[PDB]
């Protein structure tokens, strides 16, 4: 049994994984809270070493979907799904490369954004 | 019974349901508060992990 746990140690220390954690590199992708950037540990940043990569492959093939959607999607189909006034992207460029930035939509990203939108409704006020 | 708890606790490693535990995972579908999701460890998002299938599946079937 000690050798079978001492090989089962040298095997969560290499990769990272291990067994029932409590795991927070899940929830710090993008632009997030403080708070929940702030309690990362080695774990949690050796498992969000991946999962910035895997969402880079996501972001490789959405900008393709966007550039391909600029010419082979009429303007028929475009407002059709967003029912507003149809936005032309320039003839001989690329789409989406220079006035845009995609990325990955996590919940936590979508707090920080609605949180960050409150503050400075707040620090507005009535001035402006 | 050391190999019994140890055969019964290299099922529990590869699964990731453990007996009676506190799970969260239930709790974390869909767009929900930031406290709940804030608690989910390996095993809990483990069992989400399919729990967002099966919700597809139910998605996919409400849009036919």
């Known amino acids: 049994p000690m050798m079978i746990q001492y090989q089962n140690n040298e095997a969560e220390s290499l990769t990272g994984v291990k067994s029932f954690s409590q795991g927070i590199a899940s929830q710090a992708l993008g632009d997030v809270a403080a708070g929940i950037r702030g309690a990362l540990d080695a774990a949690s940043k050796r498992e969000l070493g991946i999962l910035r990569r895997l969402a880079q492959g996501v972001v490789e093939i959405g900008r393709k979907i966007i550039s391909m959607n600029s ?11 967003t029912n507003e006034q149809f ?32 503050f400075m409704l707040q620090t507005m006020g009535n001035s402006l």
């Open 71 to 81: 010419e082979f999607l009429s303007e028929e189909e475009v407002v059709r799904v």
């Open 87 to 118: 936005v032309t992207v320039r003839r001989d460029e690329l789409a989406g490369e220079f006035d845009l930035k995609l990325s990955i939509s996590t919940a936590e990203a979508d707090n920080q954004k609605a949180q960050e939108l409150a």
